[PDB]
């Protein structure tokens, strides 16, 4: 599913992402924009051998289980492919444990190099929230 910014962001707040450890709403939605373009199919290999996942490209080196990745860790406890629903539960839920271990939204390379201190509230500009 591609989601619309708008419909992206009231989906992210009803999970209970707006504000999760003090990053706004606006942090997640760019940060999925620049991910995946908002798209829960997205996946891209990295050069590791691990693959991102989903609308938040969580990555098979340490957060979920694809089958293919030797070495690497589940610590959301989930198949990958779980992150490519059109329903973000899975994926919402493993980003909250992923922010919380430390780094924070660091942890997304395009969040840090793209939204980390730019106006992000604009991505929620507009929005029915
Ligand atoms: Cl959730
Ligand atoms: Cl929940
Ligand atoms: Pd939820
Ligand atoms: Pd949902």
Redesign the pocket.
């Given at each position: 599913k591609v989601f619309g910014r708008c419909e992206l962001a009231a989906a992210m707040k009803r999970?209970?992402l707006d504000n999760y450890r003090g990053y706004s709403l606006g942090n997640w939605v760019c940060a999925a924009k620049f991910e995946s373009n908002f798209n829960t199919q997205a996946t891209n290999r990295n050069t590791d051998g691990s693959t991102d996942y989903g609308i938040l490209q969580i990555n098979s080196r340490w957060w979920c289980n694809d089958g293919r990745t030797p070495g690497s860790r589940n610590l959301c406890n989930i198949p990958c492919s779980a992150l490519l629903s059109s329903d973000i539960?899975a994926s919402?839920?493993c980003a909250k444990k992923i922010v919380s271990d430390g780094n924070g939204m660091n942890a997304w390379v395009a969040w840090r190099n793209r939204c980390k201190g730019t106006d992000v509230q604009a991505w929620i500009r507009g929005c029915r929230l």
């Open positions: 999970h209970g539960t919402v839920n």
